[PDB]
From Swiss-Prot, chains A, B, C, D:
GO terms under cellular component: chloroplast
pH dependence remark: Optimum pH is 5.5.
Regulation of this protein's activity per its record: Inhibited by castanospermine, Ag(+) and Cu(2+). 34% inhibition by Zn(2+) and not affected by EDTA.
Phenotype when changing S452L: 62% loss of activity with DIBOA-Glc and 2.4 fold increased activity with DIMBOA-Glc. 42% loss of activity with DIBOA-Glc and 4 fold increased activity with DIMBOA-Glc
Cysteine pairs bridged by disulfides in the record: C197-C203
Recorded coiled-coil stretches: none
Temperature dependence: Optimum temperature is 25-30 degrees Celsius.
Record's protein name: 4-hydroxy-7-methoxy-3-oxo-3,4-dihydro-2H-1,4-benzoxazin-2-yl glucoside beta-D-glucosidase, chloroplastic
Transmembrane segment boundaries: none
Record EC number: 3.2.1.182, 3.2.1.21
PROSITE patterns on file: GLYCOSYL_HYDROL_F1_1 (PS00572), GLYCOSYL_HYDROL_F1_2 (PS00653)
Length: 486, 486, 486, 486
């Protein structure tokens, strides 16, 4: 059963200010392909798929994906056809600096310039993510990538190259995408590149430490971010019209049951899912709950680092998909953490105390529809953290290959209904004073969905693998065309 | 999954005033047995089980039940052992007037006197239901029972006999129990005695009219009630210390989805479930929504009848078990009503727009736990209907025979948790100004649960059919003993 | 006694956004005159005045009116002199298609083009009502006008001609004006053209059916509207910058007394006054209360019709003047409806339960000042119907000829105070989130006020019948000049 | 400057229910004297004053105090003269069991019986604290008192003796008084008997561990409490009319400044001040914040212990005097805890972010008047912890010897004003639904104020040390006589 909005409840572009920005998003690895063309060096995700193909559910990889390295003009056209004003995409570190450091690859740089100039030629504003899990396997080999402090300076150099190459036209940046998802899956469960986890757990490379490596990598990400923003503000914003921040993955939470214990568990879930990386850019340190639970496994910041981190984001991106119930876990002799997410002492449940699921499943097993959860997170940003400028940098659902309730990949009425409800939830937040400046649908086009390969389609625009990777507008995409008055 | 109250959320007798009354309930047919002893005449339910045994799920009947005709002293003891202050029980019309009318049966009268005097001897207050579906089959044969206006005067005579025989000690009465359930099941689906329904539907006697007979019988019930109360107030309340009303079956309702249409559907569900009989005793007429939808099938009241009905209850009983979602049904050429409940144009759903059930199932298929629903109904009584004195005259759950999650019939922690939550919901209503005067658990003892026979056990006190119908306190009963400081 | 706003409570243009639109309104019949010039065919209102002159209170008609067919440049100047940004006027069907169908009258078309081009030349935006009660008497003779389904296609053709002739410059349309007033007065009381009512009632032509004809005509209006909007969206909005909707007459309602019955009566009054035609364009069907009370007299929509109706308005106009108390009427054998308005079972009272009138009378007998009523209706639009874009397409009061408290027709301080209070009530609604986009005063100029002829003056601008129909700015008009910073 | 209540704001007995209880409090050591008479053994406080006299500010001790061992009839009379309904006093463990364990001292037992019978003879209800810091120095010598698990069983035996000796007349008990104050001052700062603290800190016996001993002693107190209550409920409450709980010392807290960090600091202050011992009797474990910050220094409970602790109090006492601002302390390498109170990572400030003190000082340096703080704590009890029955078991202020603004010890208008404001704050809480059952002023009579000796007078009733320890009613006491209508 999937109930839709009633006809009088469907969003209208009029609901939002003239300056509010509607867009769609992608990332380099997930769409570009051409993984070894024109001098590009390999990334940790090229290496991960090439050495552990079996870690991808449907046996695929990103070697070609949507082939946006060659067909980007088609991505631009699909944005124009939907009337989107913004395109959020990422730059491939290993395409522009094949060895992570050193000599830049001109053809890599030319590619982004062509995409950028084409967007601008069509009246589309580029919002660029600098790093999207996309790390040069040359840095992974040389010092273990984000597990070494050396990544900090190397990132800074990569970011500087982006600013120098594109800063004259690109005025809106995100340093990092989803640091929490990245640390948890890459170094804790190990299901994402480089695929590390504690010995005894099942991941490609069980020789890490699921209780430490996620925190080490997160710390270097925040130090990297602080250096890049200080560099940016100091030497790459002479006109003062450019903005920089980061994009966080976030889930809404509701207490599992009516108890102060689960109220407290919900606050620890939000601290750990969102505050882990948001509170450092707000106040210069991790959430107190995290330091108290994690102790010596969570690195300390120096005074100068705290000060460089605090107020380091002009804009913040929230990537929201779903919510969970938060259920309190007792501190006791019986229990010890095994994964880093266990340090929250709050289990994420899909069903609440009455046994009901939190909302309707939308296709892939983890995305349960709960738009209230997003309005709540946006009100926490407003009331607790100073109401900084917020962009919903990702929001969307997947259609899963073979699902008998989704036999026509273009008839994505479920995705359309979801996105309408979430747009409506952003309007609710705005009406209550939340400073939300835009909504970017995750899924400009179907793409390589990491561990799920192409079997999970998140696009507004279908990619026909049987017809030359052709772009074909889905039902949702066609609704945006009308919504944006195209 | 069945989540319980946390330990600091468990009701205490202190939560309620000294005058608040805790009790338990039964009805004649469901516990007495002795269906043909000491001159008792047969009732419609004796006849219904005796001629259509197959309409009882487990093949049983009320011929003996808990044998409370002989073991009532044991029922009194179980009330005393739990520290209950009130006992709500019903008088068997056919036991006291074997032919419905005429000569009273002294032994019938003596039986109630003995029960009454024993309650009073043990400090227990009797709340008596005069009629509980319990109609003399002699009146059913002579003129079709409640389908004929003659029932009005015959009821009046029966009620007068009750007042004369017991009014010196019994000071609190209910004329009728659950008129809505009775009309719907006895004359609409026909699953309860006398078992009538429209030709073509499956009930014992498909020669009635599911679109008319329920309304005819309801009309005579309200006329009967008005005559009895006028008689009572005029000649049986000379001290002015006696109260009379009726007990209604009610379900809570929530809109199926977020739409004004389902808001309107919810109001029609409450009008039809509750207002059908409550609005007549409040204002002297049926709810407007019912007259407009039902037209000529819903009899008109005379001015004198309206005036006799309005303000006819000193107290009102609400029998609450569960809630439903109310989903709007369109008036259109495609659709015509077949059962009387269809005239509300609102379907009662157990799951809402998100696909979730309204609350946890508690054992039998129709009782889903949703205590909020009761607090809402109590606030409607306060804000809409003048906050008349309310008693929760029934509330409880069944344990179903053979259910593998309920293998020990005395370990009824589920029932205990349910009752605690509902008591807590009554406290919420009281804190908000609702004038709730008592809470009577349905289920003093396991009994004959109509169409489900004994397979559904609703008792606080177990009836051991393998041990001579012995009364054995369940876990819930033992909690009440502590709750009432016994 | 007529109390005015205090000086610190007077609206300022600053109260509303830059995009908010202030304008004034007229309709073809009421101002144009030239009823038989340049080939114009007659309308139902030409025929009605010409055959039943006695149905006009002061013995006048629209043959000349304000002679705006010749003096439109003066209407444009008066708008410019007040600094109005919008002019809402209507197109005369019979002027542009003398026989309703067939060959267009070029001189008719030229007239509107001249008015349109002149408005645009002076920076005034045209908001055009396509039909304003103004039906070609040739269609009335051929098949009974709106009482026949044939009107649907004929309207569609008329609307198409308007779109083709003026759509390049006119970007904002209303298909129909006040369908509820029209159905009630034209076919129910019969006081407006064509003047039909049930035999035995007093109207020009008592051979209709006041319980059926209003509903038949309303149904064809909604079908006509749906076809025209589908046609519009499909072939006349290629740039997507045009909007279309309809304008409803609405009255505010307050319960007559403190009783749930009058709460329910108020909801039936709003359903019948406003929902009759608004709920069909919102959800594709009449209000449930209407279908339940009116049954077979209210035609059914086909699925395709429901779908064409739902979400058919880009903008909605509300014509608001006054409010009433709504008093519950019982469904009973004693009472049967005689006029279509009786089907609401709620009488519209001018005085409430305390005997007080709802607000001060403003001149004509039916306009009692109650600005709260408008803010309430606007909040119902926001909370119940999805907050669609609302224009107050009419609002104003009449000065009545001979009224000794209004001896100087230019000194309309009463009208000024009323309009200020209502503008202030729109500001209240806006502050509470209502999406109100403009305010058009009814009464650009004094005009033919239907059954009241010219004896009721609704203009901001006086029309001096003793001085050649000269336009003279009243006090209210002069206040708008300052308000609009002219 | 000390502003008083306005005359229309002064509490009246009428403000509270008939069942609400007004009383006053004392403890054994602080008033009895006779420290070595009739066989009494010494306590830790006899020993502490006798071996470290210099730890008492004014050089005094409890050897005689108010000599209530002999003059108790005078204490009874003073209660009667004020019209108090309750007397809260404590039993001296070492008077009734000179060696802590073994043979009871009859003369000790007779003394309490005489006091008890006299109270009851005068219509005064006894509320008895079993242990009030008052530990037998024989148990301190034998195994280190509360630092050894053996105290658990020894307490149980002492409590059993109290129940057997006085349970027939005493129906309301508190197992322990102020466990948090006791652990903090006796084992953390070491300023109270037995006077232990970490080496290097300044207390009588700096050979303990201020980071561990307070938690060890608290754990044994809670285990002791659980055994005694289980014993009580099982064998000493056969009539079910007796209640037992404990009394907690509590301070109100307000965030130091407008920041989520200080909101979080306030919650850790309340957890540590109040939750330390309240959350165990509510849910069977310490607050989560404490386990997370304190780890291995905070002993674990067994499942059976958790279950014995949860819901172990029928009534709870709150001893409230003042409030503080709570200011967040960062977890970092720079900082390590030295005293147990440092484990909250929230400093208690007397001045807030604007530099203002939280309220007016009342005499001794730590009691700043802030009645709002109490209403807030009472609402947390209601909303968070289930609204258990609350008695304000202590509330009052000291007059300090030599203070030039308090030259007449009987003219305690400051104390009167404070107590009136707090009574008024309890009324506020009650009006908001808090279940507060009584108010006991701390200070029936001036007494030995631990480390401050007699120099701090907390009595409603003056003790004239220059006139034979005579009881003399102060101004506040005389106001209570009128308040209680004596």
């Amino acid at each position: 059963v999937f109930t839709k909005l009633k006809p009088w409840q469907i969003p209208k572009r009029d609901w939002f200010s003239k300056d509010f920005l509607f867009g769609a998003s992608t990332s380099a690895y997930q769409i570009e392909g051409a993984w070894n063309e024109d001098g590009k060096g390999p990334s940790t995700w090229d290496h991960f798929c090439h050495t552990y193909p079996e870690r991808i559910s449907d046996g695929t990889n990103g070697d070609v994906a949507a082939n946006s390295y060659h067909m980007y003009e088609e991505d631009v056209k699909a944005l124009k056809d939907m009337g989107m004003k913004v395109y959020r995409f990422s730059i491939s570190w290993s395409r522009i600096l094949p060895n992570g450091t050193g000599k830049p690859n001109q053809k890599g740089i030319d590619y982004y310039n062509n995409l950028i100039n084409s967007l601008i030629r069509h009246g589309i504003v580029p919002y660029v993510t600098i790093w999207h899990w996309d790390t040069p396997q040359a840095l992974e080999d040389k010092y273990g990538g984000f597990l070494d402090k050396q990544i900090v300076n190397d990132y800074k150099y990569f970011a500087e190259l982006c600013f120098q190459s594109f800063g004259d036209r690109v005025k809106n940046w995100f340093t990092f995408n989803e640091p929490h998802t990245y640390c948890c899956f890459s170094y804790g469960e190990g299901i994402h590149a480089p695929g590390r986890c504690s010995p005894g757990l099942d991941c490609a490379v069980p020789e890490g430490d699921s209780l430490r490596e996620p925190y080490t990598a997160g710390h270097h990400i925040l130090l990297a971010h602080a250096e890049a923003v200080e560099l940016f503000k100091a030497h790459y914003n002479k006109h003062g019209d450019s903005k920089i921040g980061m994009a966080f993955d976030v889930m809404g939470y509701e207490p599992y049951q009516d108890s102060f214990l689960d109220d407290q568990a919900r606050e620890r879930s939000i601290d750990y899912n969102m505050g882990w990386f948001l509170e450092p850019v707000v106040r210069g340190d991790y959430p107190f709950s995290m330091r108290s639970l994690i102790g010596d496994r969570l690195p300390m910041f120096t005074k100068e680092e705290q000060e460089k981190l605090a107020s380091s984001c002009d804009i913040m991106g929230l990537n929201y998909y779903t919510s969970r119930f938060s259920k309190h876990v007792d501190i006791s002799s019986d229990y010890t953490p095994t994964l880093n997410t266990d340090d929250a002492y709050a289990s994420s449940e899909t069903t609440g105390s009455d046994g009901n699921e939190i909302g309707p499943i939308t296709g892939t097993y983890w995305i349960y529809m709960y738009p209230k959860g997003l309005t709540d997170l946006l009100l926490i940003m407003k009331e607790k953290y100073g109401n900084p400028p917020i962009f919903i940098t990702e929001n969307g659902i997947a259609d899963v290959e073979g699902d008998p309730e989704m036999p026509d990949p273009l008839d994505d009425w479920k995705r359309l209904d979801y996105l309408q409800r979430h747009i409506s939830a952003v309007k609710d937040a705005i009406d209550q004073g939340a400073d939300v400046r835009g909504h970017f649908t995750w899924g400009l086009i179907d793409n390589f969905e990491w561990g799920s390969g192409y079997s999970s389609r998140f696009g507004l625009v279908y990619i026909d693998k049987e017809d030359g990777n052709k772009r074909k507008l889905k039902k949702s995409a066609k609704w945006f065309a009308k919504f944006n008055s195209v």
